[PDB]
Amino acid sequence: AELTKITRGMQNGAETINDNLNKLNTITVQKTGDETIAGKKTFSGDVSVDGDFTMKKFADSYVAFFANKGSGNTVTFTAPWDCTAEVELFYHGWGYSGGEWEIGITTPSGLTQIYEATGYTNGHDNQAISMPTKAIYSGLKKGLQYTFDIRDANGRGGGPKHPMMIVKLYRN
């Protein structure tokens, strides 16, 4: 705010003081009443909203989805910001000459796999049955390119059909 200087000997002292008090009163954010605040407001410390909090484009600036269109086996992406990843591989298959096959997701260097749910299949030779696999990854960093693949836990692979890996990114 641009206030007019109050000096000894000035003319229009009362009005300039009045205008300055009025300027300050109308430009300042106050501890009461409904208001509208313009400008980029950066808060250093903690902020708490007891009432109803409302924001624009939440899903765009916090949730990011990256999946491989042409293969669905390996997803390669440049992280938009710091985040937590939720990798799901929608696989369908059979174990080599029937029987056991367990699939998961590889943990890239610099990432920590919090939890893992492996996808198991048995019997039904040369027929592909649902076997989805899921894992949660923490410490994904801005600009750093990451690659999540299909890892094998136990058993042999017979052959995949219609695979699709989806990556959810909960911004940190």
């Binding site: 000997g9 229009n12 009005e15």
Partner: protein
Amino acid sequence: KGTNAWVNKDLGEGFSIQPINYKPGDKYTMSVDVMFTSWNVPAGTTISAFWMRQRYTENSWKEICTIDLPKDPSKMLNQWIRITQTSTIPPYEDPSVGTQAILNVGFFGQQEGSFTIRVRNPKQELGSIATPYMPSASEVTTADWPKFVGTYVDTNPVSSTVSSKYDWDEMKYRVYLDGTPVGGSKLLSFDLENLKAGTSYNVQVSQINGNVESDKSESVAFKTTLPK
């Protein structure tokens, strides 16, 4: 420049103090030199609300202090026109009613209208008289004030408008009534005129010595008598 439109330029940053500080009923006088270097306003196009005005806004729109500008200066182009107007401060509005200061013009009709205007020495002062151009209190210097005083006596109550009728001396003193200068003299005496009855006043004098002004003297207080 405009077509079926109001065109304005904000003058708000050129008014020392907000118009809600002026007391209702007080007079203020506006004076300005104006020149039109180009005037391209066709047949169908009409000029309206052409002025420099301080006014109330939403709901009210009532003028506080204004001056109309020439509605058709086409036959007086490239000439300095001095325009003066005394305005009476209107009564206060609701506190919710705001103010603004604008140079406005309205171009209405089929074709676009435009002009180029030069504005020299704009002035607004308290009072009913457009006195000589002066800068603001915050920008004024010793040099900006009159240097010579002229006097003559015994004639009719009204004063001559011929410089030669007066006896001209270089002023050696400046007389300040309530902080503002009201004149001066070569002599060690000055007559304070046009005062109001039963009111207290303060006067202080300074010495002039060719654009070198002394610090102001110690103030002295007096009170005009009350009439019967």
